[PDB]
Amino acid sequence: APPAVTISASYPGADAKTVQDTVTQVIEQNMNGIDNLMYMSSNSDSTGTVQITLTFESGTDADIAQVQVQNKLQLAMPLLPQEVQQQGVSVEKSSSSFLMVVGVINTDGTMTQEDISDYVAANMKDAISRTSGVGDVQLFGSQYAMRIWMNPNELNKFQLTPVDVITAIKAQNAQVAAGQLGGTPPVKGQQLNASIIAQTRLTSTEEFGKILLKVNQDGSRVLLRDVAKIELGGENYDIIAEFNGQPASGLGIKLATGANALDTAAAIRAELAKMEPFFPSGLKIVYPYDTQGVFMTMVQLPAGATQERTQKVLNEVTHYYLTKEKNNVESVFAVNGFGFAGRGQNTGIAFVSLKDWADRPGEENKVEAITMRATRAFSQIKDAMVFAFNLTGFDFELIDQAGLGHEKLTQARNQLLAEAAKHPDMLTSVRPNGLEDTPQFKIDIDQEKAQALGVSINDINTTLGAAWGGSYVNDFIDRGRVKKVYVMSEAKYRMLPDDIGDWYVRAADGQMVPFSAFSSSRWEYGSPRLERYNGLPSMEILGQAAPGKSTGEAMELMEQLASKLPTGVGYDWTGMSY
Amino acid sequence: APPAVTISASYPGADAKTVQDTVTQVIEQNMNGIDNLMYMSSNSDSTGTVQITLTFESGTDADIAQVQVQNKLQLAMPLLPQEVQQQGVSVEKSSSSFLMVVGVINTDGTMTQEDISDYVAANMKDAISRTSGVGDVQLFGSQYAMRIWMNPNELNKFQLTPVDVITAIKAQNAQVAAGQLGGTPPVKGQQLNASIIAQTRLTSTEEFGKILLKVNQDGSRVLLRDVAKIELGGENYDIIAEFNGQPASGLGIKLATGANALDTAAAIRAELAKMEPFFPSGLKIVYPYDTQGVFMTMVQLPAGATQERTQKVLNEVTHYYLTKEKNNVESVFAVNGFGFAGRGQNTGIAFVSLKDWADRPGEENKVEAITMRATRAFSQIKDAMVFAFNLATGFDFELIDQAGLGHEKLTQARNQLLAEAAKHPDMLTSVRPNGLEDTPQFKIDIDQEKAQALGVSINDINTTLGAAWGGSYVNDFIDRGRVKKVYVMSEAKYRMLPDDIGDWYVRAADGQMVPFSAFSSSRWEYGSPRLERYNGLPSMEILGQAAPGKSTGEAMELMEQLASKLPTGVGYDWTGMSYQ
Amino acid sequence: APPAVTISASYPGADAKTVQDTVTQVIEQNMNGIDNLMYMSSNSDSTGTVQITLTFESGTDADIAQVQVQNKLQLAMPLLPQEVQQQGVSVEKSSSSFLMVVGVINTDGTMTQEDISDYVAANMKDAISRTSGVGDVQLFGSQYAMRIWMNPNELNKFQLTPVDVITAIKAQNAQVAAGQLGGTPPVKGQQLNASIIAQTRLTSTEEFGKILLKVNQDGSRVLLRDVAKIELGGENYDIIAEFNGQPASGLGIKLATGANALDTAAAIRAELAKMEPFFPSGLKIVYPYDTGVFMTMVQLPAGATQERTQKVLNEVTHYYLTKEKNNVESVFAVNGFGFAGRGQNTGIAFVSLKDWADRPGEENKVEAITMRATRAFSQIKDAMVFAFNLATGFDFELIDQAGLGHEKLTQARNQLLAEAAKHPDMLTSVRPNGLEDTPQFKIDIDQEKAQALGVSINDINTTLGAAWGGSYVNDFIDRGRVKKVYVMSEAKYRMLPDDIGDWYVRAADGQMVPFSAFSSSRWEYGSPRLERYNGLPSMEILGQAAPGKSTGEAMELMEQLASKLPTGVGYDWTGMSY
Amino acid sequence: GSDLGKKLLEAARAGRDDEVRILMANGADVNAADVVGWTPLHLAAYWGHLEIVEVLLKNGADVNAYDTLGSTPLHLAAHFGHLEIVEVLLKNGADVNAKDDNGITPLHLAANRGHLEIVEVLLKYGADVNAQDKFGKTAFDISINNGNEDLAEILQ
Numbered sequence A: 001a002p003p004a005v006t007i008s009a010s011y012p013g014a015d016a017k018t019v020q021d022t023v024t025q026v027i028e029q030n031m032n033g034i035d036n037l038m039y040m041s042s043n044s045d046s047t048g049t050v051q052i053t054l055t056f057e058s059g060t061d062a063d064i065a066q067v068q069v070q071n072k073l074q075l076a077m078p079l080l081p082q083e084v085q086q087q088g089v090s091v092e093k094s095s096s097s098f099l100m101v102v103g104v105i106n107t108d109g110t111m112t113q114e115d116i117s118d119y120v121a122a123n124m125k126d127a128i129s130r131t132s133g134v135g136d137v138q139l140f141g142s143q144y145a146m147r148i149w150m151n152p153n154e155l156n157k158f159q160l161t162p163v164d165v166i167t168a169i170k171a172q173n174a175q176v177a178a179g180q181l182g183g184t185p186p187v188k189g190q191q192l193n194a195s196i197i198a199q200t201r202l203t204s205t206e207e208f209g210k211i212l213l214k215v216n217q218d219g220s221r222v223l224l225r226d227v228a229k230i231e232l233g234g235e236n237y238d239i240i241a242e243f244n245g246q247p248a249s250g251l252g253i254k255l256a257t258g259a260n261a262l263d264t265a266a267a268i269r270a271e272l273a274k275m276e277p278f279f280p281s282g283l284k285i286v287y288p289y290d291t292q293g294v295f296m297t298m299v300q301l302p303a304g305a306t307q308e309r310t311q312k313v314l315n316e317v318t319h320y321y322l323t324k325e326k327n328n329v330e331s332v333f334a335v336n337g338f339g340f341a342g343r344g345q346n347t348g349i350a351f352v353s354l355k356d357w358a359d360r361p362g363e364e365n366k367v368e369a370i371t372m373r374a375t376r377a378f379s380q381i382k383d384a385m386v387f388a389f390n391l392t393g394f395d396f397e398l399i400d401q402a403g404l405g406h407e408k409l410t411q412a413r414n415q416l417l418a419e420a421a422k423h424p425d426m427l428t429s430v431r432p433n434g435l436e437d438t439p440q441f442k443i444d445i446d447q448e449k450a451q452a453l454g455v456s457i458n459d460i461n462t463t464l465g466a467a468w469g470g471s472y473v474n475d476f477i478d479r480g481r482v483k484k485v486y487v488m489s490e491a492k493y494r495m496l497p498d499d500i501g502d503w504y505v506r507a508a509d510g511q512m513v514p515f516s517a518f519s520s521s522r523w524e525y526g527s528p529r530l531e532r533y534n535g536l537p538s539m540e541i542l543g544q545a546a547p548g549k550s551t552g553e554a555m556e557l558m559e560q561l562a563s564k565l566p567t568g569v570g571y572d573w574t575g576m577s578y
Numbered sequence B: 001a002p003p004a005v006t007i008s009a010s011y012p013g014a015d016a017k018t019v020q021d022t023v024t025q026v027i028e029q030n031m032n033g034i035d036n037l038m039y040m041s042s043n044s045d046s047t048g049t050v051q052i053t054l055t056f057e058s059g060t061d062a063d064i065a066q067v068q069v070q071n072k073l074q075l076a077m078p079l080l081p082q083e084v085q086q087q088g089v090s091v092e093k094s095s096s097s098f099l100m101v102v103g104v105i106n107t108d109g110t111m112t113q114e115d116i117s118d119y120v121a122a123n124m125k126d127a128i129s130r131t132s133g134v135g136d137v138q139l140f141g142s143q144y145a146m147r148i149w150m151n152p153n154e155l156n157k158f159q160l161t162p163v164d165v166i167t168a169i170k171a172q173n174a175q176v177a178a179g180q181l182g183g184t185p186p187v188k189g190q191q192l193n194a195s196i197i198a199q200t201r202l203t204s205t206e207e208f209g210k211i212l213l214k215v216n217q218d219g220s221r222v223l224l225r226d227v228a229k230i231e232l233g234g235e236n237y238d239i240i241a242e243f244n245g246q247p248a249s250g251l252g253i254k255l256a257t258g259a260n261a262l263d264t265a266a267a268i269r270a271e272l273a274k275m276e277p278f279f280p281s282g283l284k285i286v287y288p289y290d291t292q293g294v295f296m297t298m299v300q301l302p303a304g305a306t307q308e309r310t311q312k313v314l315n316e317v318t319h320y321y322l323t324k325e326k327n328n329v330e331s332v333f334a335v336n337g338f339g340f341a342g343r344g345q346n347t348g349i350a351f352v353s354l355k356d357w358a359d360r361p362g363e364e365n366k367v368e369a370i371t372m373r374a375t376r377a378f379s380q381i382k383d384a385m386v387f388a389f390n391l392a393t394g395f396d397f398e399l400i401d402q403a404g405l406g407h408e409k410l411t412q413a414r415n416q417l418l419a420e421a422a423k424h425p426d427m428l429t430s431v432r433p434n435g436l437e438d439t440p441q442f443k444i445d446i447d448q449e450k451a452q453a454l455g456v457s458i459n460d461i462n463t464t465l466g467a468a469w470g471g472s473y474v475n476d477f478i479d480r481g482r483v484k485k486v487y488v489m490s491e492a493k494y495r496m497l498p499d500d501i502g503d504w505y506v507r508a509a510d511g512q513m514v515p516f517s518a519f520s521s522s523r524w525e526y527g528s529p530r531l532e533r534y535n536g537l538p539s540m541e542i543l544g545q546a547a548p549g550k551s552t553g554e555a556m557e558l559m560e561q562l563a564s565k566l567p568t569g570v571g572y573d574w575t576g577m578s579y580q
Numbered sequence C: 001a002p003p004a005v006t007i008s009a010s011y012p013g014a015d016a017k018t019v020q021d022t023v024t025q026v027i028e029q030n031m032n033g034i035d036n037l038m039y040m041s042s043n044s045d046s047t048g049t050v051q052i053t054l055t056f057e058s059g060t061d062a063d064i065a066q067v068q069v070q071n072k073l074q075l076a077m078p079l080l081p082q083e084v085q086q087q088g089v090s091v092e093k094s095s096s097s098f099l100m101v102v103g104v105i106n107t108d109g110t111m112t113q114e115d116i117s118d119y120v121a122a123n124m125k126d127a128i129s130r131t132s133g134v135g136d137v138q139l140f141g142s143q144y145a146m147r148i149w150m151n152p153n154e155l156n157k158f159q160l161t162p163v164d165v166i167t168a169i170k171a172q173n174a175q176v177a178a179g180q181l182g183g184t185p186p187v188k189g190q191q192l193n194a195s196i197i198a199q200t201r202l203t204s205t206e207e208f209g210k211i212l213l214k215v216n217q218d219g220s221r222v223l224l225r226d227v228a229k230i231e232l233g234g235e236n237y238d239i240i241a242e243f244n245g246q247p248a249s250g251l252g253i254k255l256a257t258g259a260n261a262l263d264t265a266a267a268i269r270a271e272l273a274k275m276e277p278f279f280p281s282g283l284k285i286v287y288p289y290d291t292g293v294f295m296t297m298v299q300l301p302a303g304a305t306q307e308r309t310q311k312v313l314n315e316v317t318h319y320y321l322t323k324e325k326n327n328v329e330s331v332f333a334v335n336g337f338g339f340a341g342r343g344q345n346t347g348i349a350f351v352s353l354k355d356w357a358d359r360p361g362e363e364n365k366v367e368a369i370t371m372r373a374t375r376a377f378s379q380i381k382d383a384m385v386f387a388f389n390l391a392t393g394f395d396f397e398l399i400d401q402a403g404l405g406h407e408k409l410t411q412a413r414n415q416l417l418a419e420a421a422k423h424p425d426m427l428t429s430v431r432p433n434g435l436e437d438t439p440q441f442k443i444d445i446d447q448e449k450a451q452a453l454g455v456s457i458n459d460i461n462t463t464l465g466a467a468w469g470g471s472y473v474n475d476f477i478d479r480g481r482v483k484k485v486y487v488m489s490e491a492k493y494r495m496l497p498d499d500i501g502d503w504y505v506r507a508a509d510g511q512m513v514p515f516s517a518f519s520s521s522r523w524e525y526g527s528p529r530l531e532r533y534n535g536l537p538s539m540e541i542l543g544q545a546a547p548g549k550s551t552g553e554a555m556e557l558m559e560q561l562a563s564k565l566p567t568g569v570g571y572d573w574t575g576m577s578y
Numbered sequence D: 001g002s003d004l005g006k007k008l009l010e011a012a013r014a015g016r017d018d019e020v021r022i023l024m025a026n027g028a029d030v031n032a033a034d035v036v037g038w039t040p041l042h043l044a045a046y047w048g049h050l051e052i053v054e055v056l057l058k059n060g061a062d063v064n065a066y067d068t069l070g071s072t073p074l075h076l077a078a079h080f081g082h083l084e085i086v087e088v089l090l091k092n093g094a095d096v097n098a099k100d101d102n103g104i105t106p107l108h109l110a111a112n113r114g115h116l117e118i119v120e121v122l123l124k125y126g127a128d129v130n131a132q133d134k135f136g137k138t139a140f141d142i143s144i145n146n147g148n149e150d151l152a153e154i155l156q
């Protein structure tokens, strides 16, 4: 297969466009001088996430490709936002599919989905990640961060903002290098040498709670716990898993390009056997997907769909396997928020494990027939593509060649899709692989009004972003492990448009000014996922030859249809069609 | 030739010494513990550029050489100035010379040289740069940036400085992460989920011009267009190219170490075939140098020479090929500002392309005779070193400062060796520096005590000086969907003469506008516009020939005898053709 | 021997926990996706040093290993403190040992080890680096730094702090881009073109001494030399080396993979002969080790100083140079270095024997020499002193598996060691490989008092850190060579707890406030050397089988003893025992 | 002074109960101080070695020895939650209100670390509940700042 190297990076609280224009383009522009690159593609998403896939000529040493890529990326790191650099950019040489899934449950229900995910992140993942042959490890959940959930009413009452909270966290959850008594070079006759220990990282919600934000003029004290609820909670909240219906986390593991599937799986098991004896009580490993005897089910809702509606479709998928197919199905491991090659509120995947082959006698209880029956049973689910499959028509890219922009590239894509629908004898299921634009909330900061009041733009933009998107402040130590500290609004003050007006910002004169005084907003449409292909804006189209027609005849028609599109719009074949 | 890895960096508005001492030395000190390394050299230039060349033993794996050089560079990366890091430091494994040139012109004349260069940089360069076997791609021109050309009279009229301009641009050409409504974790039962979209990058001169710098006491507004002119313009203006005397741009393409030349040129032609159908009207590719059929003409004036003076010599060369060699020469692609030596204002190059073998019958009409005659015709041109040639018994000598003597004494020592070698015509022909001579520079001393007394800060002083006369990369913007740079700089007419220093104001802590003249003094002095280094020490490269019949070995042996009488602290080594 | 890669980093003025929790953990957490890794170990110590050693499977290519490690480290660089990034984080193949160690000494009493280290760095090391067959070369010392040694009494006299010193040096030892007259694009017809040259880096103590800190209100100047003494000195002062009692530097030279040992050694000697005519007076080259050297360990108690260690090494040296004058060529005494711990209370004497053929009879062979030395040195009070020459031992890692913390893991370690001593039948010399906790000086900053007074906590922490720990400010040019500038307190103002209160910080309102107004302190214990194994906190334990028992049998008991430790404590075998 | 003094600090430090008998018997200075002014009684108090504390007091160890920063073995036992040692020190005459250089008392330290059983014993033996440190803070203030209601209940 052609080897692929994957770059992943993250910008908390950024929309697709922000990610694309401060990150994706910058990295793309600096991927020169790398040998044997066939093509490059990328997604920039409204989860704050970028994935760039660099696919190499057949026969390329994946070692060398990874290194060349990493080295180029390294020289581009200084061009990226501080917020992205500090999340840590990853580069991987792996299969896109999963080798295995390690599931983790609590048989005594002593631990929630959230506790289990943190246990896994904090105690299991790193060692699994360092195992040889492990190309990519996906956590089905999030590690804990110290979460500071801010309250705008309490902030405003004490004339504070998230800037003051952030400032105080960096000053009071600090790790200070303070030198030594009797340190070198010393005076003559020194008898004593000892390290000086000043501030050290905080370790608990207790300690973060007593961060002293200010002393009032009457001598009283405003602590962090007075403007915020303080708790361990995920770095993010987007991925939730279940195993046969019960709370779960896990590791989805992908095989490093060129590694041995069996040796890697065995090494992963040997490493899990080192960790089991020190598990808290109730914790238990299950094995829901080991690559015949397994298959997956994909769940794609249209963009705009929440966690809750994706959950409901997954419950129906899970239900079906646990009721209608219970004689053939041993387990279902279901992940809400992670997709075949995506991550969003609108997607999910179920990993399905069958009983022993010998106990499923008959052609109708073999994997092919099972997956096919499941596909039929889910085909009539409302507003979701839901299909079961084990782990070929055409793969087309429509390309913006002349700075046309997203809106016009969308119009052109639609013109081509509409023309392709008028040839049902040659083309079947000609569709976008990506996502449709959705409503978004466009807020305009009045620069004149901010200046007339003495409100600083930086304070406004930090207040908005930290409250509504969350901000990674610095690190702390949770049971001896380094982990992140995040400041964000408590859920109920960031749900609705009118909530914007309850956030206040302090002017240079010390007056609190509500966000309503310097902003205005309107609804508009934009993209939750911007795609690019060899450095240019793109839209991936999938489809196939109609029955009794060759793949090549169908491709030829796509090219004819493509030649009638508006000026500036080209195309290319990629993937299976290259 | 043996394989070379090259490191390049850029520091806009930096002089050669600043480049050497903030960038080159810091990188050079980590260049050790690298396998099969023969030698290291570098130039630090007053164009703000540094190039370090690391040359490896024959047979070295170039992937591994590049990897090991880069891994040592990474040690110096966080000690480099932020202004250098942000330009994108590069590490390449290429042949030193061009495989081909891709020329671009507009047959309708509806696009200037500036537009063509931008079109090439924005729509063509990157894909070529990613093609396998492309070692180095060099743009003959510059991508557009958003240019804010400041006026100091207007800035002072509203008590503003370039610092207020830079600040205003960072704040209002901004790309903000603003989160979501209804984001996770939600209040359970939430239906509405929508991204919040706040400020986004500016995309046009119109948007930059309405940037708000201040509200006065009377409620009037000062916009950025009120203190600056605003246009699309090159990141720099140093490289201008021509095809048969028409406005042109282009890509010069060097082959990656060990790559197949045929396959690589084909992949480049295939990649151009994808771009061609989306060109705006008039735009055309031309092929002015394919690798005999072709040759180059180097043009090197002495340091201090402006663009104007280099153009005049290029015009004489171009004139010669289009008038005298009319029946032989198909095209001339001439580049002003870029030569063999890298990049500079006093340098240029012509790539010449001949008609078909079989339209040039006769021995006087072959590449060697043509080159011979062209060189002969140019030999008479004064204040210029103009040579025609088509790609050996000489030597490559390095004079090295081995005792901290410094640049001025190393020059004195170079001169002593050059004058002494000039008395031995029987053994040595044309012994000459390969480098540049010192030129007048404008030395300005900031009086710290005055600055402190007036309440003017040193950072404000240096930014105002640097932004105005050197230019400053502030942040990025989006031009026709592509990320591009934003630069502030003085409009030309305010940064041309020494007295213009006095018209730039800095704002004090107490609100007062203080002219530059109140806290600075200046004088003329000499310094270097290209500082060289060999294996990490100051150096001056000297070239020459064995005299007729006498061997290289005998010429080197003399050069070593002369080198032995030079002042204490001055040594030497042999590089390039002389190393073996 | 399996190939090994070592990551070395440095955090000046940092304690072991500060280094572990801001560097070591962060680097460990990014050591994923590396092929063929067997295990990873690390030390983080009170000198501000972390060493992370990655050991790979036998027959792994060491260059590939090095490069993969290095790329992961380099992507994690922005996650590290700036102060650590600025020292450089090196990734080197560490499994190969030395071809030769070359001492550079001064015999006529005119040069310090710092003076010698500078000469070597600027005149010798690079030519040795380019010599035929040479791989890595390590300088045992540094090039000069410009040392600014601050005086707190004069700083307070003029209402200044170290922050002001640091700010002034960044401002007045600077070199920035000032642009040109007549630069492009010009007014057409421009004739003048000239670079503008503004401030340039400082070159000398004289120039640093004239740095203007401030103009007083009566119009007098405070210059840097009025608050500080100014000298060229070392970057670091943790080590003091002598060769037969005289100041010494050196070079540690490794053979390039594939090259010839004997040709390379001769090529180095030849190259050092070329340099001898250019030396200053009394500089001499010695060859203490070159392809019969033995060592003497010196270990003083908790909290012992450099000077006290020196005294003992001086007795060790005098013993060998008198009582073994017939047998000993040299003693190279390294104060501040050991193999299982750096620090003011350790050192090591490298003893070079005269040729085999000049030491006839068994009395004058290594083995009898080392016994005599051990017998004589065992009557040194206040130190442990052991002479030694460098299939029986074992290598055990005790592992914190459940977030126990250092205190609890020590108690578990003591339980294991106390049990192993109850079985002298099976086990002998079962001991920690590392160090014990020691007194450290804990200073708490009072945030309320600092806020009431208007004293900024960054001013507090920079004042403490820069004075007592030292700070790398920026770079200067010494005789055309770029070098570092360090600020730190003069020795006599950073020796003892009382000196803390002589340091003043400037409040928001311009009043000077002593450290004692907003701080309190106490003695406590903590670790001068934290260990980790496969990314978990760990304690290495060495031992051996009792006479007439197999190493296999000894291991069996250690494992069985290990099964009875508190909940959450695990173990692993490493090194010779893997 | 004495080599046995030093050895006694080391064995008290490391919990070696038997080696502390043998060194006392041989004349080791029970009030030998290391370089930070810690006596065997400090070390035994900090590392929670009950039997060693008892053996040292019985051999005349100074119950109110202070270190170079004014801190007493009771300060250390109180801060590190060693209840049974706090009771023994207090029975042998430990000054329940001893203040260190910062004006910190054993009650402040017990209180700051939420060692309730110890706070009670300290108040039992006459610990001053309104004792201020150099910043004005009482054990009550500490309880409010750490938001430990259980400890606040006890000090009203």
Ligand SMILES: C=CC(=O)Nc1ccc(CCSc2nc(N3C[C@H](C)O[C@@H](C)C3)c3c(c2C#N)CC(C)(C)OC3)cc1
Pocket (backbone or CB within 6 Å): C098, C101, C140, C141, C142, C239, C240, C241, C248, C249, C250, C252, C288, C289, C293, C332, C334, C337, C350, C351, C352
């Ligand atoms: C900061 C100043 C400074 O370090 N000075 C300073 C000056 C000179 C020296 C050299 C002392 S001589 C010496 N040093 C060694 N070291 C290498 C080690 C990896 O770090 C050094 C610490 C000590 C070794 C050997 C010798 C010998 N002979 C022999 C073998 C068996 C090969 O083991 C290593 C060391 C330190």
